Design a protein around this ligand. Structure first.
Ligand SMILES: *C/C=C(C)/C=C/C=C(C)/C=C/C1=C(C)CCCC1(C)C
Ligand SMILES: *C/C=C(C)/C=C/C=C(C)/C=C/C1=C(C)CCCC1(C)C
Ligand SMILES: *C/C=C(C)/C=C/C=C(C)/C=C/C1=C(C)CCCC1(C)C
Ligand SMILES: CCCCCCCCO[C@@H]1O[C@H](CO)[C@@H](O)[C@H](O)[C@H]1O
Ligand SMILES: CCCCCCCCO[C@@H]1O[C@H](CO)[C@@H](O)[C@H](O)[C@H]1O
Ligand SMILES: CCCCCCCCO[C@@H]1O[C@H](CO)[C@@H](O)[C@H](O)[C@H]1O
Ligand SMILES: CCCCCCCCCCCCCC
Ligand SMILES: CCCCCCCCCCCCCC
Ligand SMILES: CCCCCCCCCCCCCC
Ligand SMILES: CCCCCCCCCCCCCC
Ligand SMILES: CCCCCCCCCCCCCC
Ligand SMILES: CCCCCCCCCCCCCC
Ligand SMILES: [Cl-]
Ligand SMILES: [Cl-]
Ligand SMILES: [Cl-]
Ligand SMILES: [Cl-]
Ligand SMILES: [Cl-]
Ligand SMILES: [Cl-]
Lengths: 223, 223, 223
């Protein structure tokens, strides 16, 4: 079950890599090339992640459980690129882009600490990591969206959809974590693997396609 | 004593985070937003550092002593942001900004090597790290200051003060290190903790306020 | 033999650092200052690498062999600066520069995995790392060169030479790796050390001088 879902991750991400890579090579202009290149590397990184986990790398027994700590290594590299999908389309300001990137990095590092420390101290870091996540939620839902809407007055719904899908998908990660054996142990590592793999596929391949469609919608509103 | 000073660090940095965070949310324009955001993340990172150390994380017995090696992890992230305070206010050129950032990173990595290696080889890395620090001192005191002064002809003293406080504070770190049990063992880990915590508070919260006042002085000289 | 070649590395890189550092301090304009600063840090990083290896740091017994894994730490920092030599001279676009940097980082991380895993699984990562290298080869030999040539119509041969020397030197690294005890064991660690040291000196000090001469050639074609 765990192995099966890791190999689904390998294949889904490698497929996503292939599509965005071809997309980058055939891109119309620099803006399409930028957005395809972003999503190509997001999926390539995740494909390497899933390859490593499937082959038994980046996993050690922590708190009595085999723990796939390597997810934080690759998430640290791929999730800023996802946030750059948003700020590239929104044409977000410099300080707001750095705030998104900074908050995200803080979230992952303190989430990594939560994952490798024993209970109950791990809950302290979980709370700190969630607080950094809540900052991201506020930044995307208010200043990022408002500015993006002012700059794309005809496409306001496009950005509302982008942020909605983003926060729906990302919010499920700490829910999976807290319900997993890291917290309340309401399901097994096998199901935990399934949930993170579903989320990763939706938030990288799925969201990657949404970002491309969002750019088409932005172009069509100024044709 | 060590625990007391670590908790003073937690509180001081978390307070500093709160002030700059509010400052960033209320900032007048993009320039104030940039500088508050820089100082917010400097203090937030240090608050995470002190939280981790206070809870017994990032410390292992090295050379027979409990050693808070995690300081190098977070210093690596927060001190480039401090240097960006200076180059943002000075409007420093691209190569000079990279030189400051590069020299700083080199200083911390070789300082980390000095801290985890045994004597006398540790002294070799201490000397290399100090050499990288001396490059920073020269870069700030001569090309950074001279260029900054040419661009702010009415505020030359503002930058002289910025650089003076910076180099006074940063020079005390290798002095603390060499006098600590890492070198001549003239004081205990408890006092060592006190000195690094005082320095960190002065060079992050204190210097952060100075940087904000420096920007006000720069604005007032062109009103 | 291993120690001798590590000390040759220390000296060659430290010499290279000194020349580019002086060059940066005396640079004519910002463009010369940028290119000297790039090459100064490339050589300074490699000098720290060779100092650490010569003193017995960054080497652990992996797969029954002492293995200088630290090379990947410093290569990760210095090789993007080499690629920036190329994109600075070519005035390469943003997505193409990120693609070069991204592919390079992927190459080194999966190459690091190949180096620390046992056979035959290490061959899987070797193949993945080479695939990332082949992407670099294609990106430099086609889109990077073509764009660079369109922007420097009078200096097309300069860029052809730059890319040729680059790919000749970089291709020798995976050949050394696969023929070393990491692969077919056709030569000893002593010779392996000699080859990586020769390559590092050619691809950093040597290529650094080529990059400077290339800039002179670019300037002379518009005098
Ligand atoms: C491609 C990978 C993605 C989008 C991963 C996203 C991960 C998160 C939003 C992580 C969230 C967490 C917290 C907010 C608290 C602590 C536990 C984490 C790391 C799962
Ligand atoms: C917020 C943290 C700050 C400003 C830390 C600054 C640290 C230094 C300037 C470190 C200096 C060192 C050397 C110059 C030599 C080796 C020992 C160090 C790392 C303490
Ligand atoms: C200054 C250091 C340089 C230019 C190092 C370059 C290293 C490489 C091009 C590494 C290549 C490798 C592969 C393509 C496959 C796996 C083995 C490596 C890491 C040697
Ligand atoms: O995303 C981009 O991020 C950059 C900051 O890194 C900004 O300068 C750009 O304006 C922004 O649109
Ligand atoms: O600080 C900033 O750093 C940048 C380099 O990162 C420069 O391009 C800006 O001009 C400089 O003012
Ligand atoms: O190299 C430089 O890299 C930058 C991207 O990091 C580009 O914006 C510049 O145009 C490019 O010439
Ligand atoms: C920058 C792209 C990296 C993607 C590949 C991630 C693979 C990491 C595997 C680490 C395993 C180390 C086990 C000892
Ligand atoms: C020229 C300087 C611009 C700075 C913009 C503010 C962005 C701050 C990013 C903080 C990220 C660090 C978190 C680890
Ligand atoms: C990017 C912001 C990071 C700030 C938090 C630093 C906490 C690091 C703790 C590491 C502890 C690991 C112990 C095993
Ligand atoms: C477009 C390229 C600009 C490069 C500017 C020079 C900055 C060099 C920074 C070196 C930092 C690396 C040290 C680890
Ligand atoms: C950013 C510049 C770094 C260059 C110096 C590299 C030295 C690394 C040595 C690491 C040794 C750790 C052994 C425990
Ligand atoms: C580890 C690999 C990540 C590097 C990917 C770089 C992508 C570059 C595309 C340009 C993005 C521009 C955003 C404003
Ligand atoms: Cl990932
Ligand atoms: Cl284990
Ligand atoms: Cl810090
Ligand atoms: Cl220990
Ligand atoms: Cl190197
Ligand atoms: Cl060992």
């Amino acid at each position: 079950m765990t192995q099966a879902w890791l190999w689904i991750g390998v294949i889904s991400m490698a497929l996503g890599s292939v599509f965005f890579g071809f997309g980058a090579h055939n891109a119309k202009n620099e803006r399409w090339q930028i957005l395809y290149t972003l999503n190509f590397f997001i999926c390539l990184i995740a494909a390497g992640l899933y390859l490593a986990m499937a082959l038994g790398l980046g996993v050690n027994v922590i708190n009595g459980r085999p723990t796939y700590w390597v997810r934080f290594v690759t998430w640290f590299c791929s999730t800023p690129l996802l946030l750059l999908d948003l700020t590239f389309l929104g044409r977000t300001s410099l300080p707001l882009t750095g705030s998104l990137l900074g908050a995200n990095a803080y979230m992952l590092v303190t989430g990594f600490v939560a994952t490798v420390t024993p209970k109950p101290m791990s809950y302290i870091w979980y709370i700190v990591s969630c607080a950094a996540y809540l900052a991201i939620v506020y930044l995307l839902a208010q200043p990022y969206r408002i500015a993006a809407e002012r700059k794309h007055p005809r496409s306001k719904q496009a950005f509302r959809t982008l942020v909605t899908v983003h926060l729906v998908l990302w919010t499920l990660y700490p829910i999976v974590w807290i319900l997993s054996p890291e917290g309340f142990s309401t399901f097994t590592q096998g199901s935990e693997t399934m949930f993170y793999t579903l989320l990763d596929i939706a938030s990288k391949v799925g969201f990657g396609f949404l970002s491309l469609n969002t750019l088409h919608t932005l172009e069509q509103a100024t044709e």
